[PDB]
Write an enzyme that holds these catalytic residues in place. Structure first.
Site, PDB file in Angstrom:
ATOM      1  N   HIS A  22      -7.531  -0.759  -5.276  1.00  0.00           N
ATOM      2  CA  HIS A  22      -7.400  -0.312  -3.904  1.00  0.00           C
ATOM      3  C   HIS A  22      -8.392   0.791  -3.582  1.00  0.00           C
ATOM      4  CE1 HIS A  22      -3.513  -2.321  -2.490  1.00  0.00           C
ATOM      5  NE2 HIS A  22      -3.827  -2.860  -3.654  1.00  0.00           N
ATOM      6  N   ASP A  80      -1.378   8.692  -1.661  1.00  0.00           N
ATOM      7  CA  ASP A  80      -1.325   9.795  -2.593  1.00  0.00           C
ATOM      8  C   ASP A  80      -2.235  10.863  -2.005  1.00  0.00           C
ATOM      9  OD1 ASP A  80      -2.085  11.459  -4.818  1.00  0.00           O
ATOM     10  OD2 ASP A  80      -2.328   9.717  -6.198  1.00  0.00           O
ATOM     11  N   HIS A 119      -3.851  14.331  -2.760  1.00  0.00           N
ATOM     12  CA  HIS A 119      -4.108  15.326  -3.768  1.00  0.00           C
ATOM     13  C   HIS A 119      -3.718  16.728  -3.296  1.00  0.00           C
ATOM     14  CE1 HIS A 119      -7.361  12.954  -6.282  1.00  0.00           C
ATOM     15  NE2 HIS A 119      -6.245  12.248  -6.202  1.00  0.00           N
ATOM     16  N   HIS A 143     -27.113  16.526  -2.044  1.00  0.00           N
ATOM     17  CA  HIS A 143     -28.294  17.372  -1.843  1.00  0.00           C
ATOM     18  C   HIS A 143     -28.802  17.100  -0.401  1.00  0.00           C
ATOM     19  CE1 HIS A 143     -32.234  19.166  -3.120  1.00  0.00           C
ATOM     20  NE2 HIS A 143     -32.671  18.462  -2.094  1.00  0.00           N
ATOM     21  N   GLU A 177     -29.115  23.999  -4.567  1.00  0.00           N
ATOM     22  CA  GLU A 177     -30.006  22.850  -4.288  1.00  0.00           C
ATOM     23  C   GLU A 177     -29.271  21.554  -4.295  1.00  0.00           C
ATOM     24  OE1 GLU A 177     -33.149  21.991  -7.426  1.00  0.00           O
ATOM     25  OE2 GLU A 177     -31.937  23.297  -8.711  1.00  0.00           O
ATOM     26  N   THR A 178     -28.423  21.325  -5.309  1.00  0.00           N
ATOM     27  CA  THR A 178     -27.705  20.092  -5.526  1.00  0.00           C
ATOM     28  C   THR A 178     -26.353  20.485  -6.138  1.00  0.00           C
ATOM     29  OG1 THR A 178     -29.724  18.876  -5.882  1.00  0.00           O
ATOM     30  CG2 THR A 178     -27.692  17.880  -6.767  1.00  0.00           C
ATOM     31  N   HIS A 205     -27.945  12.840  -5.367  1.00  0.00           N
ATOM     32  CA  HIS A 205     -29.276  13.025  -6.015  1.00  0.00           C
ATOM     33  C   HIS A 205     -29.361  12.394  -7.433  1.00  0.00           C
ATOM     34  CE1 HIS A 205     -33.261  14.718  -6.634  1.00  0.00           C
ATOM     35  NE2 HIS A 205     -33.276  15.307  -5.452  1.00  0.00           N
ATOM     36  N   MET A 251      -9.994   2.331  -0.011  1.00  0.00           N
ATOM     37  CA  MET A 251      -8.740   2.868   0.499  1.00  0.00           C
ATOM     38  C   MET A 251      -8.557   4.352   0.104  1.00  0.00           C
ATOM     39  SD  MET A 251      -5.221   0.835   1.060  1.00  0.00           S
ATOM     40  CE  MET A 251      -3.935   1.595   2.114  1.00  0.00           C
ATOM     41  N   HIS A 281      -5.702   8.911  -1.285  1.00  0.00           N
ATOM     42  CA  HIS A 281      -6.014   7.516  -1.564  1.00  0.00           C
ATOM     43  C   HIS A 281      -4.741   6.712  -1.805  1.00  0.00           C
ATOM     44  CE1 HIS A 281      -5.336   7.820  -5.998  1.00  0.00           C
ATOM     45  NE2 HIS A 281      -5.867   9.025  -5.870  1.00  0.00           N
ATOM     46  N   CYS A 282      -4.869   5.408  -1.639  1.00  0.00           N
ATOM     47  CA  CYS A 282      -3.784   4.480  -1.984  1.00  0.00           C
ATOM     48  C   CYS A 282      -3.721   4.362  -3.559  1.00  0.00           C
ATOM     49  CB  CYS A 282      -4.107   3.145  -1.322  1.00  0.00           C
ATOM     50  SG  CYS A 282      -2.819   1.875  -1.647  1.00  0.00           S
ATOM     51  N   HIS A 295       0.834  -1.209   0.000  1.00  0.00           N
ATOM     52  CA  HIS A 295       0.000   0.000   0.000  1.00  0.00           C
ATOM     53  C   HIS A 295       0.852   1.235   0.000  1.00  0.00           C
ATOM     54  CE1 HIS A 295      -3.550  -2.439   0.863  1.00  0.00           C
ATOM     55  NE2 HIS A 295      -2.884  -3.062   1.851  1.00  0.00           N
TER      56      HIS A 295
HETATM   57 CU   LIG Z   1      -3.744   0.056  -0.791  1.00  0.00          CU
HETATM   58 CU   LIG Z   2     -34.905  16.061  -4.586  1.00  0.00          CU
HETATM   59 CU   LIG Z   3      -5.957  10.556  -7.163  1.00  0.00          CU
END
Ligand SMILES: [Cu+2]
Ligand SMILES: [Cu+2]
Ligand SMILES: [Cu+2]
Ligand SMILES: [Cu+2]
Ligand SMILES: [Cu+2]
Ligand SMILES: [Cu+2]
Lengths: 337, 337, 337
Positions: B142, B95, B97, B252, B276-277, B303, B147, B132-133, B92
């Protein structure tokens, strides 16, 4: 401008360059408005898209998937000679999302094999924009056979950030992303066909599942990885234009960011900043500006990671320069506990 | 900062808590840059993700899906000790971001079972960010085994609206949304396996369909509902961080709004308002700030309501306080016509 | 404020009109807050969605898919009388994304066949907003049977661009986009059923594939084409409100643009400009403003072009007026190479 004014504008022919590279241009416009002239021949040809020998009958502007980036400035005219050779089997045309009227030009440029046409339009809005073929009644089949690209209509004063300060790139790359829909037999073996039309009914069946078999950059799995990675150096400013004519994508630079991202593609919409992953809907182009700060390998992916690493939507950048230990440091390298 | 300057900064060891809760932190930074220290141990374990006993071989940072939210401020350093115990079976890494260089840290943190590593990176950009891995060759497997998690890099000033007025929450939650791809047998029953690698080939087959079998919050159907609802009161200001490391979502709040939404997750991009969303692309985190005005039960969903109510992507909020009849009122209760 | 104050407000009874048209309204509010009264009768009804005769048991507010657009101004009160006639089979309700409290109204409006209810809410946030039925335990089935529409809450001062300049449209359309999930027999022909509930189980199995069989505007393939095409003229300013209560869409006007696009639908979020293709997530409405510059046919599509041209999501505009050769011209019409 009056009639005589338009006719007296300079005309300039430009030699195109295949993606992900881009033909010669200047960021700030050179002179006043001009008519920028391009020629593309359409090629119908089989291409291999993966390392299993899978074939598609590509429909390729200028012989590439994606078609090449054309660059003009706002209020220039783009004048394209489009040629459909007699060795091709289908009628084609072109729809520029940057253009206004006649279905983007598609209503004026329907050319059978053995025909040509010349379309001129005024590039009134600044941005990156998709272009694609759109024959009535067969629009998605041409587009998902690779018949799409992008243009960039730069502001006359070049790019700017959201406070009006210039943003001037050192390098530009154009990543066109393609969803392909390749039929398979009952054993899961991709099918092969003699002529493009022979595949139409089987391909539309796959298209209706809304699930591509392949999602690739520059026409094939791995086309921009390995020995084909894009390049940059620490300190260099890079513009990455990305298009997807039919289906959404979500670009991400693994190890970097998009410092300024016109995620809608349009330069009068202020860019988002500091992005991790941006979103470009199907039917659009976007552009990300980044200054590289660390050397080494990066990947550039659609961040549905199954699309990236199972279906092909992954590129590399190789970056030279000196490591910055302020930004990142291995305090304890992997080691036994 | 120089290496010696960083060595002299104060260190703060945080104790992580399990989503959807967030560890103790201050919205406005206390004082100058710090090295904020976190430790996470990776656990491979079976999890049950629905009421039919369906299992996933989870790969879980700190034993949870999602992994916990880590909070720092801009220009602090995040120093993670990542441990892969000998009871695990796979290599494992991690990363971030939010980080710059070496594939977000993934190139410096590859740890086999029985190893540990310590990574430090400078949190130079404010926002919420996925981590994330991403082991080479095995990246989406993964991630869609759970993960992944997120961090929040707060501005040193805390949060602000688009006019630089402060936004101060009373409460924060972290909703990690997960797409899972569970193999089924010929009768439609979900398959079980007795080691993570035994499920790999069958899982990849489901992943390539791009169609999750489940889309969940906090690792299971119903994890944030009923008596495990999120809670608030009328007048309370709540920040909901939401992440999705592999697939798009569209949050939402049923009965409410996103008053301010950093839908890209990045605090230097001004928030959308009155939403709203909102939309968070796969590979990103976003955050929504809302002041509750009405008491009662709310639902918080993806939604695409099939993904919410058939696949699992629904949570509840329970809110105390007095009903506001000006905002809403039943003029005539359901009754015979 | 208080009950005396609300009793004193003027009432305005509106007659709804069928989409894509919109009932008469004023862009700038005529006077102070009002209680704007609407009535809708729900009809469970068989509808035909394509030229093959495919049927859906639609669940239709006011008998149409989408339900009609209700238009109010910010801080008006919207007072809906909702009637579930005794000829229907199911309980229904309404959830206004514009409203605050009780699951959007859903919690207060559950009416069995033979019942009615009156809900009033204050429209405190300006924008276009989805409404939909949401019976607990059956939510997506009602929404994907067509039981959704939108409202527009105009600022009291009418629309403005991001910098405060007024934007006044000459006409408005409401395009509701509907994903339908129609079961198919072993020949792959669409099935027909006697009552809504007979199709439930088979429809849920299609919904869980997340792949609609049809994606339509105004309730059917081709509904906004031919004598039902939308219309405009060169110089005319058109607002196009678009909603999708369940699934993402990416609208595009073929041959035009979105000059100003509130892609999130919310008028306090400044619009994007010069758009080629905008993005409205499932569970939201958006709106685009465009001044037509060229006459002729246009198509207005969801720019997943398989969804537009294979699954049904394409409408037409017929535009009168004079061709502009400065914007676009055919320098050489299709002709022999
Ligand atoms: Cu992993
Ligand atoms: Cu709705
Ligand atoms: Cu990524
Ligand atoms: Cu073509
Ligand atoms: Cu197009
Ligand atoms: Cu209903």
């Amino acid at each position: 401008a009056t009639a005589a004014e338009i006719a007296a504008l300079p005309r300039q022919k430009v030699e195109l360059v295949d993606p992900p590279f881009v033909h010669a241009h200047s960021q700030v416009a050179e002179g006043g408005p001009k008519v920028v002239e391009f020629t593309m021949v359409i090629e119908e040809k089989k291409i291999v898209i993966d390392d299993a020998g899978t074939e598609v009958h590509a429909m390729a502007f200028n012989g590439t998937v994606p078609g090449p980036l054309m660059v003009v400035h706002q209020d220039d005219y783009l004048e394209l000679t489009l040629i459909n050779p007699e060795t091709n089997t289908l009628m084609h045309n072109i729809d520029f999302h940057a253009a206004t009227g006649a279905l983007g030009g598609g209503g004026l440029t329907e050319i059978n094999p053995g025909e040509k046409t010349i379309l001129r339009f005024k590039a009134t809005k600044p941005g990156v924009f998709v272009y694609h073929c759109a024959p009535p009644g067969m629009v998605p089949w041409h587009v998902v056979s690779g018949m799409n690209g992008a243009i960039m209509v730069l502001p006359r004063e070049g790019l700017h950030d959201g406070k009006g300060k210039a943003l001037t790139y050192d390098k530009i790359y154009y990543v066109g992303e393609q969803d392909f829909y390749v039929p398979r037999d009952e054993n899961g073996k991709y099918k092969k066909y003699e002529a493009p039309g022979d595949a139409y009914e089987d391909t539309v069946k796959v298209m209706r599942t809304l699930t591509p078999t392949h999602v690739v950059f520059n026409g094939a799995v791995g086309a921009l990885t390995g020995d084909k990675a894009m390049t940059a150096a620490v300190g260099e400013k890079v513009l990455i234009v990305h298009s997807q004519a039919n289906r959404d994508t979500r670009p991400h630079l693994i190890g970097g960011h998009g410092d300024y991202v016109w995620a809608t593609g349009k330069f009068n919409t202020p860019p988002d900043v500091d992005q991790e992953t941006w979103f470009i809907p199907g039917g659009a182009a976007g552009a990300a500006f980044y200054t590289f700060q660390q050397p080494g390998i990066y990947a550039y992916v659609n961040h549905n990671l199954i699309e990236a690493f199972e279906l092909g939507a992954a590129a590399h950048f190789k970056v030279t320069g000196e490591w910055n230990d302020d930004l990142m440091t291995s305090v304890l390298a992997p080691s036994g506990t």
